[PDB]
Symmetry: C2
Subunit: 172 residues, 2 copies
């Protein structure tokens, strides 16, 4: 159980007071768990950011619950960046993978595989080890992007069929 | 790292003073480690009880180093028995399997697959968990046997290619 707080994920902006109206997620931003094996398996298109949980469907919407744009973290393409997770349960881990949207992605529907560059821009094989409660690691942000984009962080848990999914809105 | 002390294994009778002349094993009865996947893979025939270690070859001999019979533990066929391991390192574990020799096995050469009933008489799937430093579990001894037999205990370590092998001489 955990989420990304750098770049801050939708579940965390719902918990932290930045976005109102998100429903159940606001009490448990750590809980966005779904099947592993993205993109071949894992949550269905349009339910990626909620990991398939109907109770967390606000996270999949292209807008925050009030219809305004999601808040974004400003980032610089091609620059190193600290990606950070906060965990409430530090499970043995297979890997962390980070994906970005493609130029021209559909910003007006729920995020889907067709919006994403499905080769991760940053991968951390983790060898079955247990992360610290706050894990910070450096990766290089993708180049060639401008404007609103989504970074999808996927944490795959060792000796399970599960992964945690965290969509973060960024501006390149 | 570990060995069986019930029924007492060859490496432990070498360490405990019961059998002299065994070489390096007497200082490290916990160390009889070889490839997993017995019987299809694992130590070669004639090196099973040493797990393939030339330095522990005394364990594979049909006699103790002085040429006398190995000491044996008297057991009753068809009766429940406490099998016990002592560990010096409590690794995450896949399983424990226990095998017995067949009637008419070749008592005059180094133990081989052809001497063994290769369906274990007792198996403990362990789910990747770490055993306690002393693990005792109950299994039913095979029936239909008399005289000198060998019980082979195999401890397979999770997320490795390795297992620990321990041959014990018994009398049915
Ligand atoms: Cu968890
Ligand atoms: Cu494991
Ligand atoms: Cu060990």
């Amino acid at each position: 159980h955990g989420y990304t707080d750098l770049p801050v994920s939708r579940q965390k902006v719902c918990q932290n007071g930045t976005v109102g109206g998100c429903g159940a997620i606001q009490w448990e931003p750590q809980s966005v768990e779904g099947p592993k094996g993205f993109p071949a398996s894992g949550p269905a298109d349009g339910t990626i950011c909620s990991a398939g949980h109907g109770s967390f469907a606000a996270l999949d919407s292209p807008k925050q619950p009030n219809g305004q744009a999601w808040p974004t973290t400003r980032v610089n393409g091609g620059q190193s960046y600290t990606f950070r997770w906060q965990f409430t349960a530090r499970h043995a881990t297979t890997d962390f993978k980070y994906y970005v949207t493609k130029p021209g992605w559909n910003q007006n529907h729920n995020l889907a595989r067709s919006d994403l560059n499905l080769t991760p821009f940053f991968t951390v094989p983790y060898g079955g080890k247990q992360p610290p409660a706050t894990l910070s690691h450096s990766g290089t942000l993708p180049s060639g992007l401008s404007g609103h984009h989504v970074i999808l962080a996927v944490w795959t848990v060792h000796d399970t069929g599960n992964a945690f999914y965290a969509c973060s809105d960024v501006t390149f």
